[PDB]
Amino acid sequence: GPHSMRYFETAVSRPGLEEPRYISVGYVDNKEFVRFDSDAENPRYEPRAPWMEQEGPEYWERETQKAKGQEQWFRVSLRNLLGYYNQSAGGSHTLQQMSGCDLGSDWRLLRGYLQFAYEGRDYIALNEDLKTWTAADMAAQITRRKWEQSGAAEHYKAYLEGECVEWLHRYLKNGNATLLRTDSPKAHVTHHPRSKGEVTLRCWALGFYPADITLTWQLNGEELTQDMELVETRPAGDGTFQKWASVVVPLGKEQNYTCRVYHEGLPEPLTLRWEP
Amino acid sequence: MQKTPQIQVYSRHPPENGKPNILNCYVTQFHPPHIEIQMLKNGKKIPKVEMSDMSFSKDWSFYILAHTEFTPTETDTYACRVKHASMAEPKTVYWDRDM
Amino acid sequence: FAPGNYXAL
């Protein structure tokens, strides 16, 4: 629904190497458009969408410069974190960051995001007021006090309200040809044996974009989600995505059931039933 | 932490025998981000396997897509084998076309 | 346009 930008950043330390592995990935409307990786031949922010090619060389040197700053910031934080959690040297550890902003259909700031994780667990997050912080444990409380003192919240607030939103407009305008596209799901139903007098009906949705989609079964026209196996939406690898829902019904009474598929690319939802 | 990876193995297009296609291996919901994935045809490692760059989800967990060109037949088996530090030994998953 | 962090954890 709401347009969005995100920067997903990761730092991984490792035994032997003094420099940790840093990777930053940028998303516009959940579609990857830029990437930085420290282990690349010539580390810089690369375009990963065809519509980003039109940015000038000056744009890319600014972004690469910020990546270098973040590498240094992540390195220092990984070291502090190691001390906070009383961990031994020579190990391997992860520091993750999610930054970004949501826009309303009216094209302005809806919600701002800024949150960190350590070893894949929540560490600290900027609150929705963009003023206060939520620390997951005692380690993160030490970071909180330090950041409260320095006015770190204000800094990120100016980013999420300022440049995050301003630059999202430019990216949305430049690449609306590809971003606002919608490929409709081509759907069907398969029938498979499960046990004595019971059958698995599976509802397929294939070749759809964007990933947002809802599949539900129903009994006699009434929504049915009791014990519905619903798989994780997965990429086809050609731009589009795939998904299925399934339900276990009695043998002979399969006609009673129908699948329902909702997707923004359709003029109206698909209703399907397994036929011989 | 150590989160066990979830593995999905599926073809890009609806599968048909003798019809060139692409087999995906979508590993998700794992941590730490080091992982070893390899795809197999009749228990033999497939040489040309493309690997996407590694991302992570809104729940912090890492995911990756491995894929290779393949032509289904009735008899041939296809599989994805993953080693990850959260598992005692590598898990193999077999491509279920009938699914 | 990526962010620039200000104060380490």
Side-chain angles (χ1 to χ4, degrees):
Chain A
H3 302 277
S4 61
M5 180 158 72
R6 296 290 142 90
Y7 277 86
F8 278 39
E9 297 166 65
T10 295
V12 181
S13 58
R14 54 211 171 167
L17 284 299
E18 191 175 320
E19 186 224 308
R21 179 76 167 280
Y22 176 73
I23 298 185
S24 174
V25 179
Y27 297 89
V28 170
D29 291 13
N30 301 292
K31 173 56 175 164
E32 181 171 308
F33 76 102
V34 289
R35 193 190 210 84
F36 181 100
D37 188 314
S38 76
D39 283 29
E41 201 90 321
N42 177 218
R44 48 158 270 192
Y45 263 98
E46 302 275 35
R48 295 225 139 197
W51 53 267
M52 279 296 296
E53 291 278 325
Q54 66 187 309
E55 299 296 338
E58 199 158 36
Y59 168 91
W60 298 110
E61 64 174 308
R62 291 174 200 282
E63 294 300 299
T64 303
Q65 280 288 138
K66 284 186 284 189
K68 301 289 180 60
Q70 295 291 103
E71 278 179 337
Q72 216 81 344
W73 186 97
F74 273 82
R75 203 227 280 109
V76 178
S77 302
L78 277 173
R79 186 216 40 163
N80 293 336
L81 286 155
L82 196 75
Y84 297 160
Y85 287 97
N86 315 295
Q87 310 191 85
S88 48
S92 194
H93 308 268
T94 296
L95 176 57
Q96 285 162 301
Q97 183 187 162
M98 280 171 65
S99 29
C101 49
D102 276 342
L103 297 184
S105 296
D106 72 309
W107 272 30
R108 223 210 335 277
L109 183 74
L110 192 57
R111 169 162 159 69
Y113 302 76
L114 166 75
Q115 49 193 312
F116 301 89
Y118 183 66
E119 319 284 38
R121 295 166 158 283
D122 285 329
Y123 184 83
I124 211 172
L126 181 56
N127 284 329
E128 194 148 331
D129 61 4
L130 309 179
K131 290 263 182 64
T132 50
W133 303 94
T134 291
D137 62 344
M138 191 77 263
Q141 303 275 104
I142 302 166
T143 294
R144 199 168 100 272
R145 297 181 212 110
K146 196 168 71 175
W147 283 12
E148 284 175 8
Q149 159 224 334
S150 62
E154 289 96 321
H155 174 83
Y156 296 109
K157 187 186 173 191
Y159 170 87
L160 298 170
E161 281 168 18
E163 289 80 357
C164 194
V165 177
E166 253 61 35
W167 281 86
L168 184 47
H169 293 157
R170 300 176 84 269
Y171 301 137
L172 283 175
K173 284 172 72 177
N174 285 318
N176 75 73
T178 320
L179 291 160
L180 294 174
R181 91 177 200 276
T182 52
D183 301 310
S184 298
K186 305 303 182 293
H188 72 290
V189 188
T190 59
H191 178 280
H192 295 102
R194 191 265 197 175
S195 83
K196 289 284 186 176
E198 293 182 62
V199 167
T200 291
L201 304 173
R202 176 160 289 118
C203 186
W204 288 93
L206 304 167
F208 62 86
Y209 183 87
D212 192 356
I213 189 171
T214 307
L215 306 200
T216 70
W217 282 92
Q218 38 178 39
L219 168 55
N220 313 335
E222 261 281 30
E223 189 184 355
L224 185 150
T225 42
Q226 270 281 2
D227 307 325
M228 189 185 68
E229 189 105 42
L230 184 67
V231 93
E232 188 185 1
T233 299
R234 72 203 192 197
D238 62 351
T240 67
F241 300 91
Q242 300 172 356
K243 201 186 189 63
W244 57 256
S246 77
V247 68
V248 178
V249 305
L251 191 68
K253 309 187 187 300
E254 305 95 338
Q255 181 58 101
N256 272 21
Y257 296 79
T258 54
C259 170
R260 199 85 167 190
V261 179
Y262 297 100
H263 195 266
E264 63 206 63
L266 305 169
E268 59 189 342
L270 303 178
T271 306
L272 305 174
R273 53 197 69 80
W274 167 76
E275 53 262 314
Chain B
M1 278 207 320
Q2 260 179 357
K3 283 192 80 194
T4 53
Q6 288 219 285
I7 306 174
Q8 295 207 72
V9 184
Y10 54 99
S11 66
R12 176 179 286 174
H13 308 276
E16 275 156 67
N17 298 330
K19 208 81 191 309
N21 206 328
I22 286 187
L23 188 68
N24 294 318
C25 181
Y26 186 51
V27 195
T28 60
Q29 288 163 63
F30 59 82
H31 178 287
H34 172 73
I35 195 163
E36 163 174 351
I37 303 171
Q38 62 184 231
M39 310 189 70
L40 296 154
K41 175 182 172 192
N42 298 330
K44 202 155 196 164
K45 196 201 76 166
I46 306 176
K48 57 244 193 188
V49 173
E50 297 279 338
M51 213 81 62
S52 70
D53 300 7
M54 197 171 290
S55 302
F56 70 84
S57 312
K58 291 156 171 287
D59 72 357
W60 305 110
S61 72
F62 293 97
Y63 65 86
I64 189 157
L65 181 70
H67 63 98
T68 189
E69 295 190 330
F70 89 123
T71 302
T73 68
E74 283 210 63
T75 54
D76 285 323
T77 65
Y78 284 98
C80 199
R81 170 160 46 173
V82 181
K83 195 205 286 175
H84 186 259
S86 65
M87 300 183 289
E89 51 158 294
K91 169 151 173 46
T92 291
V93 190
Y94 282 95
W95 171 57
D96 193 336
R97 80 203 307 283
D98 280 33
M99 190 160 204
Chain C
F1 199 77
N5 297 169
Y6 177 81
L9 274 28

